[PDB]
Amino acid sequence: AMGSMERASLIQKAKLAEQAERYEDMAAFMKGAVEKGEELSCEERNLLSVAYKNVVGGQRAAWRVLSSIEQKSNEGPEVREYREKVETELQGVCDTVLGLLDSHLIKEAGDAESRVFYLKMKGDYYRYLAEVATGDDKKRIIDSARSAYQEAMDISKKEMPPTNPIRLGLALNFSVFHYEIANSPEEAISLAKTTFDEAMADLHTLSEDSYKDSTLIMQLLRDNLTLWT
């Protein structure tokens, strides 16, 4: 759909769409940029991720409202039909993101920073599919999330310092996966604690600005540990 627009113009418009809080537009501009076939810079990867996280975040919040109403009603067909409509739209967005990662962002990502970023995205979007999945391929979807997060973890632990914000955010989100999706709260708590402690011990190496970036995510790990223990 964006084939006739220059890559640089799509990137510029994605930044404008963010400022205007037009996240569907932002995601469409960034999909167009990915489909130009060139690798993405750090900033461009963040624009892609921000766009889709906002789009799918609104869909997830709506699905949760509707699922709650539907569960109360089961204690006409309209609530189920509308929850299904939102669910299908959410699944379509997750499939779109996963398709960009598979064609061909991951295979072209050779540096640890880009490969970990994309594999964390892959884990996240399979996790969002798992949130709405029921039984049939719930297990296979959960395993796809776990596999993507695990590969990202393995690379991050070999190639990045323990304070790296992407490594920290990956560990945070994988811990949420364990707690909320995989029914493994002890694994979630262990991962969050080990991640926090190893980051704390590496803060001394950081500049003031890097310190602020890392400690912000550490506080999120602490916030979950406080809720889980």
Binding site: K15, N46, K53, N54, D124, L172, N173, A188, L227, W228
Partner: peptide, 9 residues
Amino acid sequence: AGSIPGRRS
């Protein structure tokens, strides 16, 4: 339980 908000560049 909170994941990365991730909604602002």
